[PDB]
Design a protein around this ligand. Sequence first.
Ligand SMILES: Cc1cc(C)c(/C=N/NC(=O)[C@@H](N)Cc2c[nH]c3ccccc23)c(C)c1
Ligand SMILES: Cc1cc(C)c(/C=N/NC(=O)[C@@H](N)Cc2c[nH]c3ccccc23)c(C)c1
Length: 330
Amino acid sequence: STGSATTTPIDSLDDAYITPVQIGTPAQTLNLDFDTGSSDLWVFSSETTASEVDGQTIYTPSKSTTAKLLSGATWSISYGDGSSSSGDVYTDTVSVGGLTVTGQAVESAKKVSSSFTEDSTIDGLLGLAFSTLNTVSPTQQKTFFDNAKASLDSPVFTADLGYHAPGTYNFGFIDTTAYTGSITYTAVSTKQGFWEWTSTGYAVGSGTFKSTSIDGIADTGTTLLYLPATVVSAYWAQVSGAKSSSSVGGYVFPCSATLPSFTFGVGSARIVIPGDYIDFGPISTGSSSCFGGIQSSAGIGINIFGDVALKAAFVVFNGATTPTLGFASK
Ligand SMILES: Cc1cc(C)c(/C=N/NC(=O)[C@@H](N)Cc2c[nH]c3ccccc23)c(C)c1
Ligand SMILES: Cc1cc(C)c(/C=N/NC(=O)[C@@H](N)Cc2c[nH]c3ccccc23)c(C)c1
């Protein structure tokens, strides 16, 4: 089997991408944030604290003839950014772009943090990291991809995120028309439960490539590109007037600037992030200071190849017995 679904930016800055997902019988369609940095499929629901719902579409398990309470199961997730959610668990039928999994754990939120409440366009998250990170207790549950994997034509999914435009998540096949040149594959460590890999280096604009190992995670659920402070300083030093602002929370730059590109290495291959992808617009309405799309990972504890990086590539998440990651230009 295969599935193919369009993913759409939630706003004019590509702050996140939402993908329609059918849950239950009859289908209830919710727009979920596909997150390769976590392993829980959770949704706003009829059980979510009323004051914590602000415009989201909710899953109502009582209206699904295929929903079953997973007796005694609870979940609770604390994301590294300080966001969180928790609740109980149903199993139900879940379909993405024509690919159907029966008995999928659907984690119904009773509580969500303010960040989620404020994101009216995101009805929940669909985790695509390794199932070892799933938070359901006392019986850990499998991700949608893990449940689908054996049935798929090939045990893979691909992320093709658009810049200021829709893109595509495919399951079970590689669309050879969706990228240019070749796909370069690189090793993955699953030791921390993430799609963790090692970039071979970077360049800023037309500058020379610096060969250096950068270990990080491919995370479709993170907006920005978080890299070591040395790398990030080297990038922003090429932008007149750019500076790190403790008050804003990262590097900002004059909105009048033209940003240089940023290149990252994948083996001997190179992915170029155009400068425009690194512009996140005014820090507040009407400001001439703009927020940067490349930020320091210092204090996160891991480097994160978020959407700013991933949207410059066609990315293969290969879930074979020994997982790997593939990157192509597009
Ligand atoms: C200090 C710091 C700052 C950030 C922005 C992250 C990213 N975290 N990103 C994620 O955890 C995503 N995989 C999922 C996610 C967290 N918060 C969200 C809000 C809206 C949509 C998705 C997420 C971290 C780990 C640490
Ligand atoms: C993931 C994340 C990380 C940071 C450092 C901020 C702070 N932002 N501070 C501000 O003053 C923002 N209004 C700046 C901003 C403008 N556009 C954005 C798009 C994404 C993230 C932040 C901003 C936020 C909101 C989210």
